[PDB]
Write a protein that binds this ligand. Structure first.
Ligand SMILES: C[C@@H]1O[C@@H]1P(=O)(O)O
Ligand SMILES: C[C@@H]1O[C@@H]1P(=O)(O)O
Ligand SMILES: [Zn+2]
Ligand SMILES: [Zn+2]
Lengths: 147, 148
């Protein structure tokens, strides 16, 4: 089996500009930088940036593939401000239901999509659990009267 | 304000049936829920989601080194290489490794997301890189030198 997440690595075109984004925006802690790499600690997670300077980065804009980090509601508000102050590319979200809970989607300088999300997986499940529930009328097992 | 850690990762996939089977059999993620265009998993406590996007272009991704790595033991790495080959997993040859890198296997899901099974830690790596800086260091300000 697998023992858990080891690291996540991002291919970047401009190591110094990306180091500043990962520090400023994702609040990652720098550990070591080289000529073509950077390692950071993000709340226990090992994040690596590796340079690929002349590669195409325009189809990445089409895919919803993304990574989300946990934030509170006030934190989301303060981070939207931060992403505005720092000229980050902020994506318009998909439509959301209230029970979806709040998110902010944005990308790094090379198009990797990130999200700040205020909920949990179980919230997302209780949400779907509740709507299954809303579509159930005979609780098999229940006792019916007048029979 | 603050971040608290990885909430989830979402992979855009083209074929939901084929992808769920990949994440189940290769990554060993536990499917928790399934729909027309989504599927949610739990893998060792990580929320993994697939969201279908049938008709986007998925060429350039193969040219990018961004990837996600999971920790495994060395025997597990051997086991997993056979699992991948048997299930016809696109295995990549990987970069050149110092033995000090620790062993790895790189490969892709069917839509080109790169993954890695790794047998080292950030600790191992930083210590490897530091043990290199030590090797190129010859004097210690501090010690009792012998003739000044
Ligand atoms: C650890 C940084 O991701 C790179 P590697 O997998 O090439 O070592
Ligand atoms: C949870 C799966 O990532 C998708 P969402 O960010 O659109 O909810
Ligand atoms: Zn998401
Ligand atoms: Zn790696």
């Amino acid at each position: 089996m697998l023992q858990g997440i080891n690291h996540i690595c991002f291919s970047v075109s401009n190591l110094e500009k990306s180091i500043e984004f990962y520090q400023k925006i994702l609040q990652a802690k720098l550990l070591v930088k080289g000529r073509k790499l950077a390692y950071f600690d993000l709340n226990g997670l090992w994040i690596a940036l590796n340079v690929e300077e002349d590669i195409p980065r325009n189809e990445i804009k089409q895919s919803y593939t993304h990574m989300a980090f946990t934030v509170t509601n006030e934190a989301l508000d303060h981070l939207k401000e931060v992403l505005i102050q720092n000229d980050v590319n902020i994506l318009p979200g998909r439509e959301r239901d209230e029970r979806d809970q709040r998110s902010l989607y944005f990308t790094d300088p090379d198009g990797h999509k990130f999200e700040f999300h205020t909920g949990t997986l179980q919230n997302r499940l209780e949400y779907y659990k509740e709507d299954k529930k809303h579509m159930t009328f005979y609780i098999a097992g229940e006792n019916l009267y007048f029979q």
